[PDB]
Design a protein around this ligand. Structure first.
Ligand SMILES: O=C(O)C(=O)C[C@H](O)[C@H](O)CO
Ligand SMILES: O=C(O)C(=O)C[C@H](O)[C@H](O)CO
Ligand SMILES: O=C(O)C(=O)C[C@H](O)[C@H](O)CO
Ligand SMILES: O=C(O)C(=O)C[C@H](O)[C@H](O)CO
Ligand SMILES: O=C(O)C(=O)C[C@H](O)[C@H](O)CO
Ligand SMILES: O=C(O)C(=O)C[C@H](O)[C@H](O)CO
Ligand SMILES: [Ca+2]
Ligand SMILES: [Ca+2]
Ligand SMILES: [Zn+2]
Ligand SMILES: [Zn+2]
Ligand SMILES: [Zn+2]
Ligand SMILES: [Zn+2]
Ligand SMILES: [Zn+2]
Ligand SMILES: [Zn+2]
Lengths: 253, 253, 253, 253, 253, 253
């Protein structure tokens, strides 16, 4: 077997990828999302009740479908990053990255020694298909995609420095965390927040990195796509489930 | 503690109850449905990948919310009915009931000896809250609601006989199974099928039983409600999740 | 490896075995019970929310301890009996046995062909330790113990006939089901019920079979032990947990 | 989406398919087996500790790989067959089939009304991908493959009658159950048993049905492949795991 | 929907709340505890085998009952505190707090930006009921209760400084950890340890904070209640289960 | 009950112990490994998809068998070490130890106060069997075995310093991580790497500590045993499962 090609990683340079957030924390719900045809699915280990084992179940469900899996760990924890890479997550989204030094450490966390600090356990890893991918330890690093989130004032205060880090493939703006950080909690739609988001997208793309964002607002999502934003999540499974069931009940009250 | 009042059962005689089918087979997904405000939730043990333990988890999630839980077992199996009653399911929907004899056995399956054949295990049962409901063995039978499905030609061939069974609280029409039985598989909307459904509803209510049905078609659901149908399920969580995610992706393709 | 010796089975002829009912349906709770020193633990697949997989977890927990595991299936279902024997349950308690014909079928369900109808899958079974017990298919039948429950009027109406079945090692009286059957639901303590239980124990022992019963009442349990009852369960984990926590709260209200 | 093509079913007429038995009852272990390159994987719900939910997890793991999933239910139970088809099992192996009447009922259990008795729940089923396979109710029946086991004297006594049942795609011989039935428990290698197996294979193929068998014996398996046997399982994951670990330890003792 | 009112938090100023430690790590066992009528239940993520997903299951069980849930994480880990708040834990007990600086960081960990560092993910959170609590991001902070444990010499060495931290609602004394720290491991009953505990309680209440403690000793628990201790846990489910089963067996030996 | 004797720990001074790596992350697979007769089983929480709860299930499976359980946490995290000791892991293997300061902290993480920093929760711990081991808090420390991994240049740069730490019972060499660290990723067999491993083993044994290693290469493993290496893992369950299935398929292709 040859290593799984990371099409998400390649498509950062060639197209705009439409994403769905997956917080239902369940292999069965993840498979339903995998059938729709999203370019990427975000398995949320930060804000949904997920652990390594539930994330593995969702990777296994999604793997039969063309949608590319991206995993958000709860934090930029080097040992957790090791665990998520070994279960075979090829794209990681690190929350709350605030410095070049942190971004460099996240790069190393995703690469084998001697260049990085990724723990070696190829005989045990779904990532190597338990060494059925015979050249995994040579071919792994190339199909790993590192995304970091800028979603705090300190993040914005270190944006130029993070954008200068070789090995950061993309910067994702988190509007919920960023609008709260800016003193507009629950109101990312405010012009003060939006002007910062647009300037941030422009600076990310100007530095040759992929820009990413989530908006459940169709107008904002289409505006971000018009700016050339490379990876745009357009909804959340928990949100769509709740809203679809409420909208239906409202017809009958 | 006093036994949990079965409001679904009482409301069969006082109002029209709006239902949501729950086939996501997950305590977390069931809790999302429970927040919406449906009169009843159908935990599907027949057509969703559920067992006694996953059904228990969903009952525990839903229990904090006003929505009344109804459980469909895979078949009219007396031992399985015993298991679902002891985990505290107070309303059962029995699929594919086809005779007065089978309906009578389902009545007995829901009632303690000597009048019924429900196995006695109150010290172990969530139903009795492990005997914290001190008079459970005396008060149980009154808060148990038996619904049976007519969804085959043999069912329709025995409808008057089933409607004469004391202890059957409601007859639910399954349009998917019934339309397939009638040689219109996937096409319940056909006049031939609809005329049989309307006459069946009329006969059920004429005999003093509650009538029920599921349609994801808003016009059909509102038509069934105009006929006085007592319990109408208006959607399915798997369907709404899939449809909401597809409709969203179609705005971006 | 040699087959696990069924000490419960042997001790039916040599001593009185004190039992604990295990309905917490959890490998961790079962291990707590296993540390106490009961002669036997009843893993209840009839009245606790258990399935083959949760019963396997509890067998694995209990296996490191001297307490002997007995499993109650939800009913006398031949295929379920096959499944519980293969995960390595060596003693079964069949509920609601009502005839010699049913008891004979339960005997066959526990024995390999050509004498019985137990399905053969030794390469897959924890029971054979995946054939690490090299002579399992020759030594299995001898360490299997069959117990049947008499707990209905029809059971009592066929008692002499069931006691004449070779391969029934013990008859267990279920006071909850039997008192309900007799029209004293929730009141097995009534003299009418107790006189039948005592006569039933005497007849079981007179026929050379082991007699068994459960009573959470210390006086009744000691009375049954004074009659020579061979296997007596003296409590239920769910009951003891609820009562211990209520008794403690009552000191502080 | 178009219905998943059942290549196992097609290949019954065009080649000899090599199989691996999957009794580790685990989505993670099933994925390891899926990477090897077997033509088919048997998810054993009869002799391994599986239920609908653990079988679903293994179907989801295997689905990303070319290996074709076959599911063995614990018995020819119509409602369980319904449950396994809806989670998306396209080939079923029914144990201990003993008459044309039973084989005919298993055919009906796999087909939608009005021709069969398969319960209709396409909105809830992974099988239809929750109706994302838009024509599922019209295209389902064609991609369903029914295999029945002859593994008892009564099965052999009804072989010609079973082979005359339209809708039985294949007859699998179970050497463990059959050798036990014949009074050679644990010793299927005996000439008495082998002569019956060879004649049975010849009779199956003469009637235009696919023949199947399992043997962990390389010589027997190759002899069966030489006879033209269409589906041959050549090992068992539990057996291979145990033997590989034993053989390794023996080098160091 | 309005945010769940934290009655535990309000009752810190109005009454003495009686608690039960829940370490059986199981939604089913947590529901048994929830039926008893304790003012609060401690779901132990530090010393019972719990993770975010098992803690979620226990919150869902308890939510139908008046008992207030408190969650102890394994340590004062900011990302884990984020995870436990989003699954809807409204009161946290932080183990081994040893400085004002650590206590201040725990305050921030429980509050949204810009005032705190709690990660924002309201669309995914059971805490917000997936935004069905429409003003959650404005009303959340007020119903969150922070408790910290003083249970080391360094804790006692920084007690006045911790008691001066705005946002610490209560200080809980851990007698097991504290007695071990003081060189009296397993012997918290010693006068040396008790005099420190009493003075510590007096200082906590003198600073206007709620004091808390656990003792399975009825006399010590009643002494702590006589001192005005606001939240007193009086037992542990694992302890009561083990003790109740041992005491019962001792009557029969 | 008396504390479980750590025979692995005793045997570090008296014999050479043969080990099997357990990465199938499953109570059922762990039991299969436990039946083989390995001196020790490594439950891998670093490179297999395990958490505290799945590790507990595997400890419970293994506990009925003579094989000694060793647990590798994902990192030298003090709170995780606390959690793994309380579920009853008596031997820990800490990955990537790189200084005497870190080794000293790992020693303290395994010992109760006042000498160590292990959190006290004996009432809740399987380790104390919920205090059924009456003297646990006095006898615990003696049956705990600390192993540390040297598998980086910084580890080798601090080897003499680590070997001088009282309370480190053994140093395990990780050839995968070490060969990668040395710029021979995937090629530990190279003479440059092997000469370092041999000198490292000699230095470990010269300092009076137990030396450990894993090699799936029979020749290398036997060479290490010839050097006097005290604990040698000779294979990996995931590797043996994959290879056994591949080698079998290759006979039929
Ligand atoms: O927006 C953010 O802050 C995020 O990083 C995650 C959110 O959960 C996501 O955008 C959904 O609103
Ligand atoms: O319609 C039926 O046949 C049913 O009984 C159940 C179906 O799954 C339900 O109606 C959803 O279409
Ligand atoms: O008493 C019975 O009827 C039983 O067979 C089972 C009961 O659950 C048990 O005795 C506990 O009351
Ligand atoms: O051989 C049989 O009887 C079977 O049907 C199943 C067995 O488990 C299989 O052949 C493995 O020995
Ligand atoms: O006492 C302590 O140290 C605690 O913080 C927790 C203990 O597990 C609890 O008190 C039970 O003894
Ligand atoms: O070798 C190492 O680096 C290890 O520490 C763990 C590996 O997973 C093990 O050796 C199997 O190759
Ligand atoms: Ca199950
Ligand atoms: Ca987990
Ligand atoms: Zn964010
Ligand atoms: Zn139906
Ligand atoms: Zn009974
Ligand atoms: Zn068979
Ligand atoms: Zn403590
Ligand atoms: Zn390593």
């Amino acid at each position: 077997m040859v290593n799984t090609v990371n099409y998400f990683k390649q498509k950062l340079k060639t197209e705009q990828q439409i994403g769905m957030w997956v917080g239902l924390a369940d292999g069965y719900c993840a498979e339903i999302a995998a059938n729709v045809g999203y370019d990427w699915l975000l398995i949320d280990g930060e804000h949904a009740p997920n652990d390594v084992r539930s994330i593995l179940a969702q990777l296994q469900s999604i793997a039969a479908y063309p949608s590319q899996a991206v995993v958000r760990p709860v934090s930029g924890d080097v040992p957790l990053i090791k665990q998520l890479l070994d279960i075979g997550a090829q794209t990681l989204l690190i929350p709350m990255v605030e410095s070049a030094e942190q971004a460099e450490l996240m790069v190393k966390a995703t690469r084998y020694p001697p260049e990085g600090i990724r723990g070696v356990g190829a005989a045990l890893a779904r990532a190597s298909r338990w060494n059925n991918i015979s050249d995994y330890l040579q071919t792994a690093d190339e199909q790993i995609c590192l995304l970091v989130q800028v979603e705090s004032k300190k993040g914005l205060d270190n944006l130029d420095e993070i954008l200068n880090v070789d090995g950061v493939d993309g910067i994702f703006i988190g509007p919920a965390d960023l609008s709260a950080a800016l003193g507009y909690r629950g109101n990312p739609g405010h012009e003060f927040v939006q002007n910062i988001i647009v300037q941030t997208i422009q600076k990310i793309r100007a530095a040759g990195k992929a820009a990413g964002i989530l908006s459940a607002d169709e107008k904002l999502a289409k505006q971000y796509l018009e700016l050339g934003t490379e990876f745009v999540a357009v909804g959340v499974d928990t949100s769509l489930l709740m809203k679809s069931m409420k909208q239906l009940l409202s017809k009958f009250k």
